[PDB]
Design a protein around this ligand. Structure first.
Ligand SMILES: Nc1ncnc2c1ncn2[C@@H]1O[C@H](COP(=O)(O)OP(=O)(O)NP(=O)(O)O)[C@@H](O)[C@H]1O
Ligand SMILES: Nc1ncnc2c1ncn2[C@@H]1O[C@H](COP(=O)(O)OP(=O)(O)NP(=O)(O)O)[C@@H](O)[C@H]1O
Ligand SMILES: [Mg+2]
Ligand SMILES: [Mg+2]
Lengths: 342, 342
């Protein structure tokens, strides 16, 4: 059973390689069968079927690469399931936090892998093998004009240099200069857990998906104070945000604003702040390709377009926002790839 | 009547020069008397008496420089008072937004002045004349150690280069390289209006002061997810924030958290994000002295220490956080100084 595992502060990501080029043990068969015949595991486990890499050749075997996720909160259940029925490559903060918990599985050997190595290695790997013939990486062409703005593939055959912006619970920013030369540049604590935390407080939403659905209906200008609110008009345009949630300092506006407006304003606030940080690190690092990963952006087209627009506008076209189909899973994958070393 | 006025998105700042080296018109006398014998004007006007510059020599006159503030929301009342009872130098967004409103005062000539010129000129001026013999500018020595951390004067006789971080409703960042060479570097919309807006929504506080008072009692770790929450322990220390409000994604934590915790977490979130942006622009601009202005920091020691600690820690001592006694008033002052030109 070949597994790579990225245990983050919010989500566990699992990459699983299923051999297809196959008298083995019954419970080994039962795990394989359980994983390939189900797309929901328990009440919170999900296999991302559309992300599956087929007929991949890995470690001299032909197989399928599957991508699975569940909340870190439910890791105890995953471990319990484990003790009822192995070398495990694992990265993310939880690799250390839950180390002792994994060892309650008799004989199981836990190999903790550097989160930096795993993410970069997993990123490079997936891009090099392609997404079943198609581009793993893509950008939004004409990011400023909604009429022309559309998703289009983007080539990363020579991916250096690269600024990687990892939006999970918080934000980590990496600069990748070559194969064995890359570093963590900085980070902010205003990431996806800020969006989801604030939004739950402000709106009472009880999933990421529900927060996105609310945001899609709202009007962030109802909560944000714009340049034109301060100036009366328009190098800042009047519609640009001058103060996020700045109009909520007025009691009468707080009482007229809806949950949807507030969800949207939370999303716009977090996203735009991340774009701005990203742009600043790119200038500092002299890198013009900025790739976004993590799960803040999954099924989140709004944030992706905001980032694309912001990097493009602010930079006059010199900075390009890039995105990745497998954006949440690169740590899990790089962990899996560290398996031969042991 | 010599006035400089900075009309922002939230507050109006007024600098007033009172001549002391004096058969003039009765209502001119009555305004002077009104301003010098009162420290509260109406229900929302305040004269900052402790900031007064005494026996200043300006435009060949000896006088006192007074500093006054009131909410932009109440500017209509100030204007009405004006029409019942003049060249006005004014800057900030409201100089444009309320231009027509000022002209309802018969014959009054409104001179709009560039916000950049005013802020820098006013900053340089105040530092050069000193705060009645004492330092206008100060830092927090040993910013990382609470036992040794104390406020101490700081010399700006040669203030170039200088990174000015203006925290008002949003955040504006300036790089000042010389007397006539300075530029706006970037800005974020996560500023004081974000702190005050979010905090009002989350806590029901109804003044900046009440939000600060709440924050002073709270525990931000109750809302924030820390490095140790994710890793189990500790180059990030375990107490550093990994995800602002990241623990509010759990329903049970949202229901146990208090208003004070939430006020504090809002303050810590906004402040630390501003420190991080500031550090990034300083590296980009290759400037190691970073000065904070605006009114987000007035009677806000907590945010000042957070910034001082963050710039010092992250930069290993190469970046110094600086603060200014008259931090909210430099635009108003630079506007006043533009008076001779007309
Ligand atoms: N089904 C989901 N449940 C919870 N959060 C989700 C979900 N889908 C998307 N998200 C968002 O994705 C974010 C987490 O992304 P992720 O990259 O998996 O972080 P992480 O690895 O768990 N945290 P970290 O330890 O900081 O690296 C959350 O903060 C949400 O904003
Ligand atoms: N008495 C107060 N009332 C309202 N806000 C206050 C008060 N005291 C301090 N503040 C804080 O100070 C901030 C405003 O600072 P300030 O520099 O005067 O902004 P501004 O000039 O009005 N806005 P801007 O147009 O963006 O430059 C507010 O966002 C608050 O966070
Ligand atoms: Mg992660
Ligand atoms: Mg201002």
């Amino acid at each position: 059973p070949w597994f790579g595992m990225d245990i983050g502060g919010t989500l566990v990501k699992l990459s699983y390689f299923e051999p297809i080029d196959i008298e083995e043990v019954e419970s080994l068969k039962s795990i394989r069968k359980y994983l390939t015949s189900n797309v929901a595991y328990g009440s919170t486990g999900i296999r991302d079927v559309h992300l599956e890499l087929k007929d991949l050749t890995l470690f001299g075997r032909r197989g399928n690469l599957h991508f699975i996720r569940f909340p870190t909160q439910d890791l105890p259940t995953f471990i319990q399931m484990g003790r009822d029925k192995t070398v495990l490559c694992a990265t993310g903060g939880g690799a250390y936090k839950f180390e002792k918990d994994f060892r309650t599985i008799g004989n199981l050997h836990l190999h903790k892998l550097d989160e930096l190595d795993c993410l970069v290695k997993g990123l490079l790997y997936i891009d090099s093998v392609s997404f079943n013939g198609q581009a793993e990486c893509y950008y939004f062409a004409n990011a400023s004009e909604p009429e022309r703005c559309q998703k289009m593939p983007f080539n990363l055959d020579d991916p250096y240099p690269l600024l990687v912006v990892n939006i999970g619970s918080g934000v980590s920013i990496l600069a990748v200069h070559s194969k064995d030369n890359y570093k963590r540049v900085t980070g902010t604590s205003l990431g996806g857990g800020t969006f989801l935390g604030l939004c739950s407080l402000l709106t009472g939403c009880e999933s990421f998906e529900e927060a996105l659905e609310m945001a899609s209906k709202g009007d962030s200008t109802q909560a944000d104070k714009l340049v034109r609110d301060i100036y009366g008009g328009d190098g800042l345009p009047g519609w640009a945000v001058a103060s996020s949630f700045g109009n909520m300092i007025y009691k009468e506006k707080r009482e007229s604003v809806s949950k949807e407006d507030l969800a949207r304003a939370t999303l716009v606030t977090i996203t735009n702040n991340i774009g701005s940080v990203a742009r600043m690190c790119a200038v500092n690092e002299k890198i013009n390709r900025v790739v976004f990963v993590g799960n803040f952006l999954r099924v989140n087209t709004l944030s992706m377009k905001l980032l694309a627009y912001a990097l493009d506008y602010w930079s006059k076209g010199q900075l390009k926002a890039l995105f990745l189909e497998h954006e949440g899973y690169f740590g899990a994958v790089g962990a899996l790839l560290g398996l031969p070393n042991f």
